[PDB]
Design a protein around this ligand. Structure first.
Ligand code: HEM
Ligand code: CL
Ligand code: MG
Ligand code: MG
Ligand code: MG
Length: 378
């Protein structure tokens, strides 16, 4: 049985070779698992939320890495907590944030240009853009963006010790417990939505609201950052800068970057009951991992799956999952990726890797996939 997950040799090309639509793998600690690799079967498993549980608190729930063996919407509260958050992620709300996002993107590209050719785009642009956008989504005031960017970078850089990362988490938790006491006082940001819902229902504690805000930061930061960095590397390889600069094409270019990069490579479930997926017999308690990256390269819905093609038709990719746990932030993540890539390649059309692609350095198998650094000239 092959190991899952494996290290990406090239960080913007997922580890494939897995048989479809279902195959047997071994997790890091030897636990057997069904890996779901077909696109249709991916959707079926993610939609069948009673049979395929994401209850991380249940003892059968599979860990994909040692570091994650040792925040999240618990099952009884899930639909209520999700409905709370979704009111802060309307299409109108994201459209309203676009001007703020392009201001954040431009001020970080000012810093890229100030430093000059040789700059690491990860530390200066790809990591900071999505933490500062989450600042603006939450209502974190401009004066505190530097502190918040710095502590969220400590968690996500994947260069800090487990202790340095726990420290940074605690600082952001402290900061947000302070800030939320000032919210619901005329603002329309995510922290005001949460206060207004607590004030209206009286059944949510302020610590639970801080936990929900930290969940958004953790779900929305490294994922968006790593799909932005990998997007840039992939566009530079494909000579695709110019298409990303095109305001009519950047939406479709971003869908194709999401399909390719699938930075949340797999999501874990466990069977709560005996079932069958594509004829395969699944016992209650069995690990079931949905390989979103592999579902995204199923040659049925995505013929010529490995080619970069923004014009691609057919079914939606599952980079953001599907069904009742589908990415709440998907619309915000698209807007962010579109404005960041559009403004980067308009301002710096001659952008190029300052080292060979083979020297970018990938992240570890277990976590959000990505590069450690992205040095660039123009
Ligand atoms: C490129 C960016 C992103 C990727 C690849 C991504 C990926 C995912 C995936 C695969 C899921 C489904 C988890 C599962 O089924 O087990 C998910 C859920 C979620 N995402 Fe995202 N995401 C992105 C951006 C964001 C952003 C920007 C936010 C918030 C600001 C966010 C917040 C969440 C939340 C709260 C959930 C949980 C929803 C639930 O369980 O009901 N994500 N994301
Ligand atoms: Cl150090
Ligand atoms: Mg456990
Ligand atoms: Mg520099
Ligand atoms: Mg893929």
């Amino acid at each position: 049985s092959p190991q899952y997950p494996q290290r990406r040799a090239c960080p913007y090309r997922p580890a494939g070779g897995y048989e479809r639509p279902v195959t047997r793998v071994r997790l890091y600690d030897g636990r057997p698992a069904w890996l779901v690799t077909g696109h249709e079967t991916a959707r079926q498993v993610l939609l069948d939320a009673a049979t395929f549980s994401s209850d991380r608190q249940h003892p059968a729930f599979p860990a994909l890495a040692a570091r994650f063996e040792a925040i999240g919407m618990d099952p009884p509260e899930h639909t209520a907590q999700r409905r709370m958050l979704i009111s802060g992620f309307t299409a109108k709300r994201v459209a309203t944030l676009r001007p703020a996002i392009t201001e954040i993107v431009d001020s970080l590209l000012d810093e890229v240009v100030r430093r000059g050719p040789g700059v690491d785009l990860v530390a200066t642009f790809t990591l900071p853009v999505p933490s500062v956008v989450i600042c603006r989504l939450l209502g974190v005031p401009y004066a505190d963006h530097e502190f918040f960017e710095h502590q969220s970078r400590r968690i996500a850089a994947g260069t800090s010790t487990a202790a340095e990362s726990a420290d940074a988490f605690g600082q952001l938790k402290r900061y947000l417990l302070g800030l939320i006491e000032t919210k619901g006082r005329g603002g329309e940001d995510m922290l005001d939505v949460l206060v207004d819902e607590q004030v209206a229902t009286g059944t949510v504690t302020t610590p639970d609201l801080v936990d929900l805000a930290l969940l958004l930061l953790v779900a929305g930061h490294e994922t968006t950052a790593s799909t932005l960095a990998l997007g840039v590397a992939l566009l530079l390889e494909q000579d695709g800068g110019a298409v990303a600069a095109d305001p009519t094409r950047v939406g479709a270019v971003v869908e194709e970057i999401l399909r390719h990069t699938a930075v949340a490579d797999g999501v874990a479930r466990f069977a709560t009951r005996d079932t069958e997926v594509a004829g395969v017999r699944i016992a209650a308690g069995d690990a079931v991992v949905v390989a979103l990256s592999a579902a995204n390269r199923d040659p049925g819905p995505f013929p010529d799956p490995d080619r970069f093609d923004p014009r691609r038709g057919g079914r939606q990719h599952v980079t953001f999952g599907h069904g009742p746990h589908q990415c709440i932030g998907a619309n915000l993540a698209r807007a962010e990726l579109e404005i960041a890539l559009s403004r980067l390649f308009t301002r710096l059309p001659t952008l190029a890797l300052a080292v060979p692609v083979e020297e970018l350095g990938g992240k570890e198998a277990g976590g959000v996939q990505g590069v450690q650094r992205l040095p660039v000239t123009w």
